[PDB]
Amino acid sequence: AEPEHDERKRLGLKTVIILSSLYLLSIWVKKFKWAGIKTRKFVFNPPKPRK
Amino acid sequence: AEVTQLSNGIVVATEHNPSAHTASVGVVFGSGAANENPYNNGVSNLWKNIFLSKENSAVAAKEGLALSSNISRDFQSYIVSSLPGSTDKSLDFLNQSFIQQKANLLSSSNFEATKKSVLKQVQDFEENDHPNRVLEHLHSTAFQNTPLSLPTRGTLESLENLVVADLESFANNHFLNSNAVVVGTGNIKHEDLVNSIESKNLSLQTGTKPVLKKKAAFLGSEVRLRDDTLPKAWISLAVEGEPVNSPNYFVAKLAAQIFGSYNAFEPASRLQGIKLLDNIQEYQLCDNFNHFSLSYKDSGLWGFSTATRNVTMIDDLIHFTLKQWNRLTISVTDTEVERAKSLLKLQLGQLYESGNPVNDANLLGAEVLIKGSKLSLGEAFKKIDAITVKDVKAWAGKRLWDQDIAIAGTGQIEGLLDYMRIRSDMSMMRW
Numbered sequence: 316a317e318p319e320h321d322e323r324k325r326l327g328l329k330t331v332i333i334l335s336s337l338y339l340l341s342i343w344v345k346k347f348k349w350a351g352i353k354t355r356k357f358v359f360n361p362p363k364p365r366k
Numbered sequence: 367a368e369v370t371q372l373s374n375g376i377v378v379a380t381e382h383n384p385s386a387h388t389a390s391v392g393v394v395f396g397s398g399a400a401n402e403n404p405y406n407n408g409v410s411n412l413w414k415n416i417f418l419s420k421e422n423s424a425v426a427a428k429e430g431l432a433l434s435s436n437i438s439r440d441f442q443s444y445i446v447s448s449l450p451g452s453t454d455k456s457l458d459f460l461n462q463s464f465i466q467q468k469a470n471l472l473s474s475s476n477f478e479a480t481k482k483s484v485l486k487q488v489q490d491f492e493e494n495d496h497p498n499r500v501l502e503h504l505h506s507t508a509f510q511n512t513p514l515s516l517p518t519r520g521t522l523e524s525l526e527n528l529v530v531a532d533l534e535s536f537a538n539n540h541f542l543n544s545n546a547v548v549v550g551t552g553n554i555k556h557e558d559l560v561n562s563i564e565s566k567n568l569s570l571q572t573g574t575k576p577v578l579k580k581k582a583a584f585l586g587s588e589v590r591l592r593d594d595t596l597p598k599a600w601i602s603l604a605v606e607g608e609p610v611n612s613p614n615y616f617v618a619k620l621a622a623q624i625f626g627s628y629n630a631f632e633p634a635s636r637l638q639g640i641k642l643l644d645n646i647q648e649y650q651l652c653d654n655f656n657h658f659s660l661s662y663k664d665s666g667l668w669g670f671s672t673a674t675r676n677v678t679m680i681d682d683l684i685h686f687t688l689k690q691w692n693r694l695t696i697s698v699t700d701t702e703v704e705r706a707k708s709l710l711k712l713q714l715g716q717l718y719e720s721g722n723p724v725n726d727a728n729l730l731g732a733e734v735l736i737k738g739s740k741l742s743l744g745e746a747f748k749k750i751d752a753i754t755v756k757d758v759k760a761w762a763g764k765r766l767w768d769q770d771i772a773i774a775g776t777g778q779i780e781g782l783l784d785y786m787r788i789r790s791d792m793s794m795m796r797w
Contacts, residue, residue, distance in 0.1 A: 351785045 369730065369740045370559070376543055376569070378562045379734045380550040381726065389450045389552035390723040391457060393464070394731030395442030396545040397575055399518045400664070402536065408484065408520030409528060409536045410437055415480045416471055417444070421463055429455050434724055437518050439662050442540075443728045450553050457561055465569050468537055472530060481525070488519045496600055496776060497656075497671060503589040503774035504602045505667070510585065513578045514664050539576060543569040547734050551727035582664040586789070589774035590782075598653070599674045601684070601775040601782065605766055607659050607666030610736050616750050617761045618659050622668060623706045623713070624698070625690065628655035640702065642690045650676050651683045663736055668765070680781040688792050695762035696797055703755055711747060718743050768793045 317323075369381045399410050414435045425431050431452065436443035444464070448456045463471065492499065502517045509515035546569050550558035561567075584606045608614040628643065629635045630653050636643075646652055653676070658669040670687070674680060718729065733740045771789055775782070782788070 348786060 371739060374563050377547045378559060379547055379730055380558050381730055382555050384553055386721055386723055387450050387553055388447055388723055389453050389554050390445055390447040390727055391453050391558060392445040392549040392727045394547045394549055396440055396735040397540045398437045398440040398442050400439040400514050401578060404516045406532050407516050407524035409533050411484055411519055412480060412533055415484050419480060420471055420476055425459060431456055436728055443731060445724050445727050447724060453554050453557055454561060461567055465541060485522060485525055497673060500600045500602045500775050504604055504772055507587040507589045507774045508584060508604055508772040509582060512580060512582050514582055538571050541569050542575060543572045544574050547731050549727045549731045551730055552723045584770055586770040586772050590779050591776040592779050594778055596777045599677055599680060599777045599779060601672055602773060603670040604772045605668045605769050607661050607668040609666050610661045610663055614761055615661060617753055617757050618668060620706050620710055620753055621758060621762060622657050622659035623710045624702055625657045642686055645686055651679050677778050678781055681783055684788055685791060691766055692793055692795050695759060695766060698755055700755060707750060714743060714746060
């Protein structure tokens with residue numbers, strides 16, 4: 316039905332390993348450069364009431 | 367015109383200069399608005415203003431002599447100008463009204479009037495001014511939780527909680543004899559060398575200056591005050607400069623002169639300059655530059671500042687300035703280094719040789735406390751003629767290649783992209 320079982324499984328294993336590693340790296344980098352805004356703090360000040 | 371030091375209880379340094387004829391004895395303290403913790407911020411300011419009000423009122427009616435002061439980070443600069451031949455009266459007054467006694471000046475009514483005047487002044491400085499505001503914010507953001515970031519003036523909340531006792535404690539813990547030079551800039555020669563040593567011309571509480579625990583640090587942050595009511599914008603980049611007494615001070619100062627100043631409303635400034643000025647003038651990208659490299663004992667800051675009427679093209683100004691800074695460490699024309707050397711020589715010559723003795727007194731005190739001995743401008747010329755493109759390349763590669771930047775600008779800043787297209791673009795070029 317598919318004379319490609321062995322090669323398919325091997326390529327799938329290679330691809331899943333590469334993709335898993337890449338996905339974890341992407342998680343880390345997203346945590347990294349998004350951290351410049353996921354921790355900013357705002358402090359309000361009541362502006363002087365004059366107009 | 368030679369500077370003479372010594373160490374007899376109190377360091378005494380003199381710089382005779384027969385050109386001018388306004389003798390100005392002085393006193394300089396090496397601990398100002400940095401060696402004090404944030405909760406008592408404006409004590410130096412209160413001292414400054416009580417001096418400048420009541421002692422100024424007293425002196426002129428007593429004799430003929432003005433008086434001034436200053437503070438930058440660690441500088442209780444404190445100068446009593448006079449005529450060439452009346453310095454003994456100046457020292458007598460300085461003895462009898464600044465180091466002792468500290469009780470007749472610190473009256474309740476006088477202190478409270480000073481308190482309200484200081485509050486009003488800091489308030490309208492926070493309201494009206496802007497470039498100095500963003501500069502103080504830059505210092506505050508660069509040195510978070512470090513005894514260097516609190517402003518020279520202070521904060522109203524900090525000001526309101528001071529009456530006498532903390533001011534007295536600061537007086538007894540920083541007016542020592544260990545770090546108190548007696549500058550003599552003007553046209554005096556040796557009377558300052560002898561009269562400063564008398565029966566009791568010696569600061570109270572001899573001892574040492576209490577050293578702070580933490581030293582300094584650097585980390586990038588924003589303190590923007592985004593408000594659309596004001597017309598223009600304001601930005602202030604920064605990268606960690608070179609601390610005083612380092613073999614990189616002058617090369618950093620040169621790197622703070624290649625770009626130079628600018629003012630887009632002058633026929634003599636829009637036309638000369640370097641590649642960025644050619645690239646900006648096509649539109650009205652900006653309206654002002656101010657390149658500077660401030661240095662302090664703890665650490666130093668290589669500044670930048672604009673004030674742009676245009677509010678939509680902020681990012682392009684930032685990107686162009688960053689590309690110039692990026693390529694400053696890859697290729698500099700030798701003629702650019704030559705022109706920078708000449709211009710910087712002019713700037714130092716103008717600064718150190720101003721006709722006003724007060725500024726020379728300030729700088730002499732600064733160097734004598736920090737370096738330990740004044741570096742004559744002649745040696746500055748000889749040691750700057752040897753600065754070659756290799757040295758600037760090395761220093762720029764050390765201090766300006768993927769480094770933390772601190773930016774803090776008030777006004778209309780919403781057009782400024784926040785932090786990644788203002789930092790990660792600072793080396794993007796394929797070096």
